[PDB]
């Protein structure tokens, strides 16, 4: 059996509204309903990996796993294997995979983050799973963020707490948060961002939904506007939304949105909103294509409709050579020329770089850069030609061109990262000086840039 170079991944997010599901939920896993839906001709073709995120989930783990497995069994005639299940309060993540992948999956990690403080600690937060699939690292986050139209800034703070504190992936990547640890990271959930229009416009909104005219509503979606203004989810992608708002429905139908203020809502309006979302972030120049993004129309036990998204995702093979793993391949090298960082810092410490990659035996520390004052105030940290020559473990171009180098710029005084980024080795040419670039972030916010030239030598 050849190792795959692509897999398909199903992502589901459903806020179940504390109610048991209906007897049939197969439409969710088939990507059928409204939006970008899956072709009927693919119904019997299993995805490689199913990742199910629930919020307000009233079921036990056993009860939900039996429903999920029996659903997929009916659709595909495949008995899926449980990779991981993790629950925080009523927030849950399940990862299922084809049985043929059991030996391809390793380094399974789970974690959760509880958001907020006192009053605001005890039901919101996130759960996550990571693992390796052959040579590819995969991360998955299911978050239930703070509710309420007037709490977008709290949701943004919940996001930053989750990506700072969720401990997934390779712990050796100590300067890096989850936004840099994975070849592919999927972040989904009841993110709770709302369509920010006046309360008086509720019936106008409903009209627009009935006309399938989502444009004037999406222009006020808080997640899209906060992303455009770089307030949250920096460097994540979302597929275009072409389905109706998934919240807040009257239960047992999808014919009615329940938006008006009630004691049960804390006297808050719930204008129709796209609360339930799937976003992703993949390393540069790795294949990732969204092939469905939509909501079901026939699952009506909750005041939310389930959301689905599916992806093609590039994967690589667990490379063995005569040499690496367990030695270098003197044939291979990575050289850096004319490199500098630009930092948005008022500090004047010296800085050095660390280079982290699973193509290295271990991470490499550079010498200190030369600080220069940027013409518009910034700090320019010059490395020129001084950066180390990296010695990959395998020099075969079929391996090396698929790799990535994580970069952290650290203070010499404190050894704290001021910025993290990633460079693809998927170059247009080898043995050729070529421009490289990454933005640098810390705690998920932009802190600067790294740029220069690279020179990659492979065995070919
Ligand atoms: O080649 C690229 C360059 C920039 C982006 C990031 N995008 C750009 C547009 C946009 C609009 C609204 C909210 C977020 C974003 C983020 C993606 C690909
Ligand atoms: O107020 C200023 C006046 C001159 C410079 C010029 N330097 C020179 C070298 C260099 C190397 C790498 C990146 C940038 C630069 C810019 C910068 C700021
Ligand atoms: O450590 C170095 C890194 C890059 C360069 C080459 N470039 C970088 C950009 C720039 C901008 C403005 C004036 C000059 C330059 C010189 C030189 C030294």
């Amino acid at each position: 059996q050849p190792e795959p170079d692509m897999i398909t991944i199903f992502i589901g997010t459903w806020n179940m509204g504390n109610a048991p599901p209906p007897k049939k939920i197969t439409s969710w896993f088939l990507s059928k309903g409204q939006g970008k839906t899956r072709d009927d001709s693919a119904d019997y073709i299993p995805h490689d990996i199913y990742v199910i995120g629930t919020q307000e989930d009233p079921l036990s783990e056993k009860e939900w796993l039996e429903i999920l497995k029996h659903s997929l069994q009916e659709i595909t005639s495949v008995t899926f294997k449980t990779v991981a299940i993790h629950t925080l309060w009523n927030i849950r993540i399940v990862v299922l995979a084809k049985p043929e992948h059991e030996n391809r999956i390793s380094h399974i990690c789970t974690d959760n983050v509880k958001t907020g403080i006192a009053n605001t600690l005890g039901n919101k937060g996130a759960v996550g799973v990571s693992f390796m699939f052959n040579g590819t690292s995969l991360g998955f986050v299911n978050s239930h963020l703070t509710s309420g139209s007037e709490k977008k800034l709290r949701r943004n703070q919940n996001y930053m707490n989750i990506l700072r504190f969720l401990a997934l992936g390779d712990k050796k990547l100590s300067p890096f948060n989850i936004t840099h640890r994975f070849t592919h990271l999927f972040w989904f959930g009841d993110l709770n961002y709302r369509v920010d229009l006046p309360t008086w416009e509720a019936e106008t909104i409903i009209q627009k939904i009935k006309q399938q005219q989502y444009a004037d509503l999406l222009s006020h979606d808080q997640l899209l506007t906060e992303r455009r203004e770089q307030k949250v989810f920096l460097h994540f992608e979302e597929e275009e939304i072409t389905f109706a708002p998934t919240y807040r429905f009257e239960r047992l139908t999808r014919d009615k949105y329940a938006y008006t203020k009630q004691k049960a809502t804390g006297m808050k309006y719930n204008l129709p909103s796209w609360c339930d979302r799937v976003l992703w972030k993949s390393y540069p120049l790795v294949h990732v294509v969204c092939q469905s993004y939509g909501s079901t129309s026939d699952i009506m036990t909750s005041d939310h409709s389930p959301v689905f998204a599916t992806f093609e995702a590039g994967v690589t093979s667990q490379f063995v050579s005569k040499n690496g793993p367990g030695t270098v391949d003197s044939q291979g090298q990575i050289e850096f020329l004319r490199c500098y960082a630009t930092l948005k810092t008022k500090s004047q410490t010296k800085f050095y770089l660390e280079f982290h990659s699973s193509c290295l035996e271990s991470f490499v520390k550079s010498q200190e850069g030369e600080n220069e004052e940027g013409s518009e105030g910034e700090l320019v940290v010059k490395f020129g030609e001084t950066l180390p020559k990296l010695k990959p473990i395998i020099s075969d171009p079929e391996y090396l061109l698929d790799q990535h180098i994580l970069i952290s710029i650290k203070s010499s005084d404190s050894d704290e990262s001021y910025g993290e980024g990633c460079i693809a080795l998927r170059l247009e040419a080898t043995e050729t000086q070529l421009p490289i670039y990454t933005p640098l972030t810390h705690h998920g916010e932009l802190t600067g840039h790294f740029q220069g030239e690279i020179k990659l030598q492979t065995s070919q």
Side-chain angles (χ1 to χ4, degrees), residues 2-460:
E3 295 305 306
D5 66 358
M6 222 87 100
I7 60 170
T8 75
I9 301 171
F10 176 96
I11 307 297
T13 182
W14 185 28
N15 180 319
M16 296 177 72
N18 302 112
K23 56 181 196 262
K24 182 161 198 63
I25 58 167
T26 53
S27 60
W28 190 22
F29 308 122
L30 293 175
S31 295
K32 303 293 181 65
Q34 293 181 317
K36 182 185 191 76
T37 63
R38 181 159 184 244
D39 198 78
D40 295 333
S41 69
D43 292 350
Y44 305 150
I45 301 171
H47 297 294
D48 293 286
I49 304 178
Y50 295 76
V51 185
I52 307 93
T54 53
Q55 313 85 34
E56 299 290 84
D57 181 339
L59 304 175
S60 69
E61 288 183 354
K62 172 176 177 177
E63 281 165 339
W64 188 221
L65 190 55
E66 182 185 338
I67 287 159
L68 293 174
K69 288 197 162 185
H70 284 155
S71 292
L72 294 182
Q73 230 291 142
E74 176 170 49
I75 287 166
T76 67
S77 292
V78 173
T79 305
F80 277 77
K81 294 293 190 161
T82 305
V83 174
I85 179 165
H86 189 67
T87 308
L88 169 68
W89 296 318
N90 298 94
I91 308 163
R92 178 175 291 153
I93 188 167
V94 181
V95 180
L96 307 176
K98 295 171 165 173
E100 72 203 68
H101 296 325
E102 181 180 0
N103 301 294
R104 295 182 172 119
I105 291 168
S106 68
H107 299 86
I108 302 162
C109 305
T110 61
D111 196 25
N112 63 260
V113 168
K114 299 170 176 190
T115 55
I117 58 192
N119 291 249
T120 73
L121 202 157
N123 79 286
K124 299 303 195 295
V127 293
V129 176
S130 68
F131 52 93
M132 295 293 304
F133 183 93
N134 285 342
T136 301
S137 60
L138 303 176
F140 305 90
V141 178
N142 173 21
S143 68
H144 192 181
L145 308 185
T146 293
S147 69
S149 70
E150 310 309 300
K151 296 198 175 156
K152 81 185 181 191
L153 295 183
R154 287 284 177 263
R155 289 185 274 283
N156 299 343
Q157 289 169 338
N158 296 160
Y159 165 83
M160 183 192 276
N161 284 317
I162 295 159
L163 73 87
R164 282 179 71 181
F165 296 123
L166 198 65
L168 296 173
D170 177 7
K171 303 315 182 274
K172 289 180 170 160
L173 293 177
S174 57
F176 300 103
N177 63 61
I178 56 164
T179 78
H180 284 114
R181 285 190 179 193
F182 305 107
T183 320
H184 305 277
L185 172 61
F186 299 90
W187 189 324
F188 49 96
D190 179 2
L191 308 189
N192 248 324
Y193 293 90
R194 306 308 179 91
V195 168
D196 218 337
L197 281 167
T199 298
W200 55 264
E201 294 283 45
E203 282 301 327
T204 307
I205 294 165
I206 291 174
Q207 294 204 326
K208 297 296 194 189
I209 299 167
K210 289 181 179 169
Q211 295 168 94
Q212 301 200 359
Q213 287 178 17
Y214 308 138
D216 297 348
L217 306 184
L218 291 158
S219 70
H220 298 270
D221 167 70
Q222 292 167 336
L223 182 54
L224 286 165
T225 62
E226 289 297 274
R227 282 180 60 225
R228 187 181 289 283
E229 293 180 36
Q230 295 182 44
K231 306 298 186 75
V232 74
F233 277 105
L234 184 62
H235 304 142
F236 281 75
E237 300 184 57
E238 188 186 28
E239 180 63 274
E240 185 183 349
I241 292 169
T242 63
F243 51 100
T246 58
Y247 182 69
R248 180 178 190 217
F249 290 101
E250 178 170 318
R251 297 177 195 232
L252 308 185
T253 183
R254 299 289 84 156
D255 290 339
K256 187 186 269 134
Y257 283 97
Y259 63 80
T260 199
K261 69 180 189 181
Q262 289 275 255
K263 284 187 262 181
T265 69
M267 301 307 292
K268 291 178 220 297
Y269 289 92
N270 289 298
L271 294 181
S273 291
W274 288 278
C275 289
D276 308 298
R277 308 289 275 268
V278 179
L279 298 94
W280 74 97
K281 180 183 185 188
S282 302
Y283 284 168
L285 300 180
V286 180
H287 184 85
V288 53
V289 173
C290 181
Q291 290 286 27
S292 70
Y293 190 35
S295 64
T296 61
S297 305
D298 61 336
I299 297 168
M300 303 172 296
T301 52
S302 179
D303 56 351
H304 297 244
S305 287
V307 165
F308 48 81
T310 60
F311 301 84
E312 296 177 352
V315 293
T316 64
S317 284
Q318 306 181 36
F319 217 94
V320 182
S321 73
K322 290 164 182 212
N323 309 315
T327 191
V328 295
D329 209 348
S330 88
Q331 292 154 110
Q333 54 175 65
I334 316 172
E335 293 179 290
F336 295 96
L337 299 92
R338 301 176 62 160
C339 286
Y340 67 98
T342 306
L343 291 180
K344 313 173 183 292
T345 188
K346 296 170 193 187
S347 142
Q348 263 295 352
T349 182
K350 295 204 222 143
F351 291 93
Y352 66 92
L353 301 184
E354 290 181 2
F355 298 94
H356 290 72
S357 181
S358 54
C359 76
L360 306 175
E361 283 239 321
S362 64
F363 79 84
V364 176
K365 275 145 143 44
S366 84
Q367 299 197 293
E368 289 171 327
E370 180 195 350
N371 293 355
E372 190 178 88
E373 159 104 43
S375 64
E376 277 174 289
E378 335 96 285
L379 175 68
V380 171
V381 183
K382 302 184 305 194
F383 292 98
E385 308 309 304
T386 68
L387 292 173
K389 184 189 288 164
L390 305 182
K391 300 306 193 77
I393 63 168
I394 289 164
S395 64
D396 182 338
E398 290 247 57
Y399 167 85
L400 196 52
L401 291 160
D402 279 351
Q403 307 304 310
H404 293 80
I405 310 299
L406 294 174
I407 297 178
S408 169
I409 181 158
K410 282 172 145 201
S411 160
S412 294
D413 292 349
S414 72
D415 288 317
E416 60 189 325
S417 185
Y418 278 59
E420 301 101 56
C422 182
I423 301 297
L425 297 187
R426 189 68 78 64
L427 307 186
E428 289 293 350
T430 64
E431 298 182 292
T432 302
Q433 295 173 32
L434 291 165
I436 57 169
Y437 170 72
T438 183
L440 297 173
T441 63
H442 191 66
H443 298 162
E445 297 192 324
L446 192 68
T447 60
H449 306 275
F450 178 78
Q451 58 208 270
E453 294 178 321
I454 201 169
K455 208 175 112 202
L456 179 67
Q457 197 172 104
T458 68
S459 65
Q460 284 299 104

